[PDB]
PDB file of all heavy atoms in Angstrom:
ATOM      1  N   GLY J   1      84.962  46.318 121.609  1.00 26.56           N
ATOM      2  CA  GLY J   1      84.253  46.594 122.907  1.00 26.56           C
ATOM      3  C   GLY J   1      83.366  47.894 122.903  1.00 26.56           C
ATOM      4  O   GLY J   1      83.260  48.575 121.906  1.00 26.56           O
ATOM      5  N   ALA J   2      82.785  48.113 124.061  1.00 22.74           N
ATOM      6  CA  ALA J   2      81.911  49.315 124.287  1.00 22.74           C
ATOM      7  C   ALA J   2      82.718  50.653 124.137  1.00 22.74           C
ATOM      8  O   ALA J   2      82.233  51.587 123.475  1.00 22.74           O
ATOM      9  CB  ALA J   2      81.192  49.262 125.552  1.00 22.74           C
ATOM     10  N   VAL J   3      83.869  50.653 124.788  1.00 25.47           N
ATOM     11  CA  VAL J   3      84.761  51.898 124.726  1.00 25.47           C
ATOM     12  C   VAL J   3      85.379  51.948 123.277  1.00 25.47           C
ATOM     13  O   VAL J   3      85.339  53.010 122.680  1.00 25.47           O
ATOM     14  CB  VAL J   3      85.877  51.854 125.726  1.00 25.47           C
ATOM     15  CG1 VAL J   3      86.952  52.857 125.417  1.00 25.47           C
ATOM     16  CG2 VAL J   3      85.335  52.039 127.176  1.00 25.47           C
ATOM     17  N   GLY J   4      85.832  50.798 122.766  1.00 25.56           N
ATOM     18  CA  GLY J   4      86.449  50.759 121.470  1.00 25.56           C
ATOM     19  C   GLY J   4      85.517  51.278 120.415  1.00 25.56           C
ATOM     20  O   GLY J   4      86.022  51.979 119.370  1.00 25.56           O
ATOM     21  N   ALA J   5      84.216  51.031 120.503  1.00 26.54           N
ATOM     22  CA  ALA J   5      83.304  51.621 119.514  1.00 26.54           C
ATOM     23  C   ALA J   5      83.251  53.149 119.605  1.00 26.54           C
ATOM     24  O   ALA J   5      83.057  53.792 118.591  1.00 26.54           O
ATOM     25  CB  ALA J   5      81.907  51.035 119.766  1.00 26.54           C
ATOM     26  N   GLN J   6      83.422  53.705 120.803  1.00 26.27           N
ATOM     27  CA  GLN J   6      83.395  55.150 121.007  1.00 26.27           C
ATOM     28  C   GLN J   6      84.776  55.760 120.594  1.00 26.27           C
ATOM     29  O   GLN J   6      84.813  56.878 120.202  1.00 26.27           O
ATOM     30  CB  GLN J   6      82.999  55.533 122.391  1.00 26.27           C
ATOM     31  CG  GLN J   6      81.544  55.115 122.734  1.00 26.27           C
ATOM     32  CD  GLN J   6      80.508  55.538 121.723  1.00 26.27           C
ATOM     33  OE1 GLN J   6      80.633  56.731 121.234  1.00 26.27           O
ATOM     34  NE2 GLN J   6      79.538  54.760 121.397  1.00 26.27           N
ATOM     35  N   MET J   7      85.807  54.939 120.694  1.00 28.14           N
ATOM     36  CA  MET J   7      87.149  55.338 120.198  1.00 28.14           C
ATOM     37  C   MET J   7      87.137  55.446 118.657  1.00 28.14           C
ATOM     38  O   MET J   7      87.733  56.393 118.151  1.00 28.14           O
ATOM     39  CB  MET J   7      88.221  54.342 120.600  1.00 28.14           C
ATOM     40  CG  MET J   7      89.157  54.866 121.675  1.00 28.14           C
ATOM     41  SD  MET J   7      89.790  53.606 122.738  1.00 28.14           S
ATOM     42  CE  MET J   7      90.384  54.583 124.101  1.00 28.14           C
ATOM     43  N   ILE J   8      86.400  54.514 118.032  1.00 31.55           N
ATOM     44  CA  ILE J   8      86.262  54.616 116.581  1.00 31.55           C
ATOM     45  C   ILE J   8      85.424  55.907 116.183  1.00 31.55           C
ATOM     46  O   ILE J   8      85.865  56.643 115.289  1.00 31.55           O
ATOM     47  CB  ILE J   8      85.515  53.383 116.066  1.00 31.55           C
ATOM     48  CG1 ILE J   8      86.417  52.207 116.140  1.00 31.55           C
ATOM     49  CG2 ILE J   8      85.042  53.584 114.598  1.00 31.55           C
ATOM     50  CD1 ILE J   8      85.718  50.834 115.862  1.00 31.55           C
ATOM     51  N   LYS J   9      84.372  56.188 116.962  1.00 32.53           N
ATOM     52  CA  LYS J   9      83.563  57.348 116.653  1.00 32.53           C
ATOM     53  C   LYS J   9      84.350  58.665 116.850  1.00 32.53           C
ATOM     54  O   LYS J   9      84.227  59.609 116.082  1.00 32.53           O
ATOM     55  CB  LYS J   9      82.268  57.391 117.454  1.00 32.53           C
ATOM     56  CG  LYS J   9      81.145  58.310 116.863  1.00 32.53           C
ATOM     57  CD  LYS J   9      80.045  58.519 117.837  1.00 32.53           C
ATOM     58  CE  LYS J   9      79.046  59.462 117.298  1.00 32.53           C
ATOM     59  NZ  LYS J   9      79.055  60.847 117.903  1.00 32.53           N
ATOM     60  N   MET J  10      85.128  58.748 117.869  1.00 33.09           N
ATOM     61  CA  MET J  10      85.873  59.982 118.208  1.00 33.09           C
ATOM     62  C   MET J  10      87.076  60.151 117.216  1.00 33.09           C
ATOM     63  O   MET J  10      87.421  61.300 116.894  1.00 33.09           O
ATOM     64  CB  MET J  10      86.427  59.922 119.645  1.00 33.09           C
ATOM     65  CG  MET J  10      85.311  59.931 120.704  1.00 33.09           C
ATOM     66  SD  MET J  10      84.453  61.550 120.746  1.00 33.09           S
ATOM     67  CE  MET J  10      82.959  61.170 119.698  1.00 33.09           C
ATOM     68  N   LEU J  11      87.614  59.090 116.666  1.00 34.04           N
ATOM     69  CA  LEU J  11      88.645  59.170 115.653  1.00 34.04           C
ATOM     70  C   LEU J  11      88.044  59.593 114.302  1.00 34.04           C
ATOM     71  O   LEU J  11      88.637  60.346 113.588  1.00 34.04           O
ATOM     72  CB  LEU J  11      89.365  57.777 115.522  1.00 34.04           C
ATOM     73  CG  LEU J  11      90.329  57.443 116.645  1.00 34.04           C
ATOM     74  CD1 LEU J  11      90.948  56.047 116.416  1.00 34.04           C
ATOM     75  CD2 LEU J  11      91.433  58.488 116.732  1.00 34.04           C
ATOM     76  N   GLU J  12      86.869  59.052 113.988  1.00 34.58           N
ATOM     77  CA  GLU J  12      86.141  59.475 112.832  1.00 34.58           C
ATOM     78  C   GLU J  12      85.875  60.972 112.794  1.00 34.58           C
ATOM     79  O   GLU J  12      85.872  61.571 111.730  1.00 34.58           O
ATOM     80  CB  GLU J  12      84.821  58.683 112.772  1.00 34.58           C
ATOM     81  CG  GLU J  12      85.022  57.263 112.319  1.00 34.58           C
ATOM     82  CD  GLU J  12      83.665  56.450 112.333  1.00 34.58           C
ATOM     83  OE1 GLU J  12      82.678  56.946 112.915  1.00 34.58           O
ATOM     84  OE2 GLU J  12      83.671  55.350 111.821  1.00 34.58           O
ATOM     85  N   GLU J  13      85.664  61.569 113.983  1.00 33.20           N
ATOM     86  CA  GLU J  13      85.350  63.013 114.091  1.00 33.20           C
ATOM     87  C   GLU J  13      86.496  63.851 114.528  1.00 33.20           C
ATOM     88  O   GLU J  13      86.341  65.036 114.895  1.00 33.20           O
ATOM     89  CB  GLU J  13      84.135  63.193 115.022  1.00 33.20           C
ATOM     90  CG  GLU J  13      82.866  62.498 114.527  1.00 33.20           C
ATOM     91  CD  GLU J  13      81.718  62.567 115.589  1.00 33.20           C
ATOM     92  OE1 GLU J  13      81.824  63.289 116.582  1.00 33.20           O
ATOM     93  OE2 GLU J  13      80.722  61.752 115.394  1.00 33.20           O
ATOM     94  N   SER J  14      87.799  63.264 114.556  1.00 31.01           N
ATOM     95  CA  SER J  14      88.907  63.927 115.030  1.00 31.01           C
ATOM     96  C   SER J  14      89.548  64.773 113.888  1.00 31.01           C
ATOM     97  O   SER J  14      89.318  64.577 112.658  1.00 31.01           O
ATOM     98  CB  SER J  14      89.944  62.896 115.507  1.00 31.01           C
ATOM     99  OG  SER J  14      91.079  63.516 116.124  1.00 31.01           O
ATOM    100  N   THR J  15      90.361  65.763 114.374  1.00 31.13           N
ATOM    101  CA  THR J  15      91.100  66.635 113.443  1.00 31.13           C
ATOM    102  C   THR J  15      92.429  65.915 113.067  1.00 31.13           C
ATOM    103  O   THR J  15      93.115  66.413 112.082  1.00 31.13           O
ATOM    104  CB  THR J  15      91.441  67.989 114.094  1.00 31.13           C
ATOM    105  OG1 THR J  15      92.011  67.850 115.383  1.00 31.13           O
ATOM    106  CG2 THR J  15      90.125  68.774 114.381  1.00 31.13           C
ATOM    107  N   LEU J  16      92.790  64.834 113.735  1.00 33.04           N
ATOM    108  CA  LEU J  16      94.044  64.101 113.559  1.00 33.04           C
ATOM    109  C   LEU J  16      94.222  63.619 112.093  1.00 33.04           C
ATOM    110  O   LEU J  16      93.315  63.021 111.572  1.00 33.04           O
ATOM    111  CB  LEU J  16      94.039  62.934 114.536  1.00 33.04           C
ATOM    112  CG  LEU J  16      95.165  62.575 115.471  1.00 33.04           C
ATOM    113  CD1 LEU J  16      95.612  63.742 116.336  1.00 33.04           C
ATOM    114  CD2 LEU J  16      94.786  61.353 116.276  1.00 33.04           C
ATOM    115  N   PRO J  17      95.396  63.945 111.547  1.00 33.14           N
ATOM    116  CA  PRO J  17      95.671  63.458 110.133  1.00 33.14           C
ATOM    117  C   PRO J  17      95.936  61.927 110.187  1.00 33.14           C
ATOM    118  O   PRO J  17      97.035  61.593 110.636  1.00 33.14           O
ATOM    119  CB  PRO J  17      96.896  64.215 109.688  1.00 33.14           C
ATOM    120  CG  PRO J  17      97.611  64.625 110.959  1.00 33.14           C
ATOM    121  CD  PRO J  17      96.504  64.664 112.038  1.00 33.14           C
ATOM    122  N   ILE J  18      95.002  61.132 109.733  1.00 34.23           N
ATOM    123  CA  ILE J  18      95.200  59.666 109.823  1.00 34.23           C
ATOM    124  C   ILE J  18      95.341  59.098 108.426  1.00 34.23           C
ATOM    125  O   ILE J  18      94.428  59.131 107.634  1.00 34.23           O
ATOM    126  CB  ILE J  18      94.069  59.012 110.566  1.00 34.23           C
ATOM    127  CG1 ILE J  18      93.964  59.601 111.959  1.00 34.23           C
ATOM    128  CG2 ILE J  18      94.131  57.488 110.582  1.00 34.23           C
ATOM    129  CD1 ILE J  18      92.634  59.309 112.671  1.00 34.23           C
ATOM    130  N   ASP J  19      96.484  58.447 108.154  1.00 34.92           N
ATOM    131  CA  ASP J  19      96.729  57.861 106.858  1.00 34.92           C
ATOM    132  C   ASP J  19      96.202  56.346 106.839  1.00 34.92           C
ATOM    133  O   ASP J  19      95.678  55.912 105.806  1.00 34.92           O
ATOM    134  CB  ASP J  19      98.195  57.851 106.508  1.00 34.92           C
ATOM    135  CG  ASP J  19      98.709  59.177 106.000  1.00 34.92           C
ATOM    136  OD1 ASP J  19      97.855  60.088 105.622  1.00 34.92           O
ATOM    137  OD2 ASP J  19      99.950  59.467 105.928  1.00 34.92           O
ATOM    138  N   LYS J  20      96.294  55.709 107.995  1.00 32.01           N
ATOM    139  CA  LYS J  20      96.005  54.282 108.090  1.00 32.01           C
ATOM    140  C   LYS J  20      95.384  54.014 109.453  1.00 32.01           C
ATOM    141  O   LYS J  20      95.852  54.444 110.481  1.00 32.01           O
ATOM    142  CB  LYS J  20      97.250  53.458 107.916  1.00 32.01           C
ATOM    143  CG  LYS J  20      97.002  51.998 107.663  1.00 32.01           C
ATOM    144  CD  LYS J  20      98.377  51.284 107.593  1.00 32.01           C
ATOM    145  CE  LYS J  20      98.212  49.755 107.433  1.00 32.01           C
ATOM    146  NZ  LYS J  20      99.464  49.090 106.842  1.00 32.01           N
ATOM    147  N   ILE J  21      94.254  53.208 109.482  1.00 33.13           N
ATOM    148  CA  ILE J  21      93.692  52.703 110.679  1.00 33.13           C
ATOM    149  C   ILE J  21      93.808  51.179 110.745  1.00 33.13           C
ATOM    150  O   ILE J  21      93.573  50.530 109.778  1.00 33.13           O
ATOM    151  CB  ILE J  21      92.171  53.090 110.740  1.00 33.13           C
ATOM    152  CG1 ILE J  21      91.963  54.512 111.446  1.00 33.13           C
ATOM    153  CG2 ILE J  21      91.372  52.093 111.608  1.00 33.13           C
ATOM    154  CD1 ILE J  21      91.893  54.555 112.923  1.00 33.13           C
ATOM    155  N   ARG J  22      94.083  50.677 111.983  1.00 35.95           N
ATOM    156  CA  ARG J  22      94.055  49.277 112.246  1.00 35.95           C
ATOM    157  C   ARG J  22      93.227  49.041 113.496  1.00 35.95           C
ATOM    158  O   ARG J  22      93.276  49.782 114.462  1.00 35.95           O
ATOM    159  CB  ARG J  22      95.453  48.674 112.398  1.00 35.95           C
ATOM    160  CG  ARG J  22      96.278  48.835 111.200  1.00 35.95           C
ATOM    161  CD  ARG J  22      97.779  48.474 111.383  1.00 35.95           C
ATOM    162  NE  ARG J  22      97.810  47.068 111.887  1.00 35.95           N
ATOM    163  CZ  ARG J  22      98.858  46.574 112.473  1.00 35.95           C
ATOM    164  NH1 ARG J  22      99.983  47.258 112.645  1.00 35.95           N
ATOM    165  NH2 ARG J  22      98.842  45.375 112.939  1.00 35.95           N
ATOM    166  N   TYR J  23      92.422  47.936 113.507  1.00 35.69           N
ATOM    167  CA  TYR J  23      91.566  47.526 114.629  1.00 35.69           C
ATOM    168  C   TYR J  23      92.137  46.263 115.195  1.00 35.69           C
ATOM    169  O   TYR J  23      92.168  45.256 114.484  1.00 35.69           O
ATOM    170  CB  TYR J  23      90.129  47.332 114.140  1.00 35.69           C
ATOM    171  CG  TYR J  23      89.341  48.557 113.789  1.00 35.69           C
ATOM    172  CD1 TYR J  23      88.155  48.481 112.999  1.00 35.69           C
ATOM    173  CD2 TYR J  23      89.743  49.807 114.192  1.00 35.69           C
ATOM    174  CE1 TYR J  23      87.435  49.612 112.682  1.00 35.69           C
ATOM    175  CE2 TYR J  23      89.034  51.013 113.924  1.00 35.69           C
ATOM    176  CZ  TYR J  23      87.836  50.856 113.115  1.00 35.69           C
ATOM    177  OH  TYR J  23      87.129  51.983 112.809  1.00 35.69           O
ATOM    178  N   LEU J  24      92.600  46.247 116.396  1.00 38.33           N
ATOM    179  CA  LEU J  24      93.058  45.059 117.122  1.00 38.33           C
ATOM    180  C   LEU J  24      92.143  44.652 118.150  1.00 38.33           C
ATOM    181  O   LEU J  24      91.490  45.417 118.794  1.00 38.33           O
ATOM    182  CB  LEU J  24      94.450  45.383 117.753  1.00 38.33           C
ATOM    183  CG  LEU J  24      95.723  45.293 116.909  1.00 38.33           C
ATOM    184  CD1 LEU J  24      95.560  46.043 115.542  1.00 38.33           C
ATOM    185  CD2 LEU J  24      96.949  45.725 117.656  1.00 38.33           C
ATOM    186  N   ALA J  25      91.988  43.342 118.326  1.00 33.44           N
ATOM    187  CA  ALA J  25      91.212  42.723 119.407  1.00 33.44           C
ATOM    188  C   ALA J  25      91.782  41.351 119.734  1.00 33.44           C
ATOM    189  O   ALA J  25      92.963  41.139 119.589  1.00 33.44           O
ATOM    190  CB  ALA J  25      89.727  42.685 119.064  1.00 33.44           C
ATOM    191  N   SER J  26      90.973  40.368 120.250  1.00 32.02           N
ATOM    192  CA  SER J  26      91.465  39.112 120.606  1.00 32.02           C
ATOM    193  C   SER J  26      91.307  38.071 119.522  1.00 32.02           C
ATOM    194  O   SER J  26      90.800  38.438 118.359  1.00 32.02           O
ATOM    195  CB  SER J  26      90.727  38.547 121.859  1.00 32.02           C
ATOM    196  OG  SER J  26      89.439  38.047 121.572  1.00 32.02           O
TER     197      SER J  26
END
């Protein structure tokens, strides 16, 4: 979605230590 795309962008630029990403939808 429109928000989900910005959630991806904010996670990409986050300080959060992320080992694994998953994208869920319908």
Side-chain angles (χ1 to χ4, degrees):
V3 170
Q6 300 305 321
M7 252 150 194
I8 290 169
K9 199 194 179 255
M10 293 292 96
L11 283 178
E12 284 175 349
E13 297 171 17
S14 189
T15 53
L16 229 55
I18 298 166
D19 282 343
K20 195 183 176 159
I21 274 273
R22 300 174 53 198
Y23 288 163
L24 276 50
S26 78

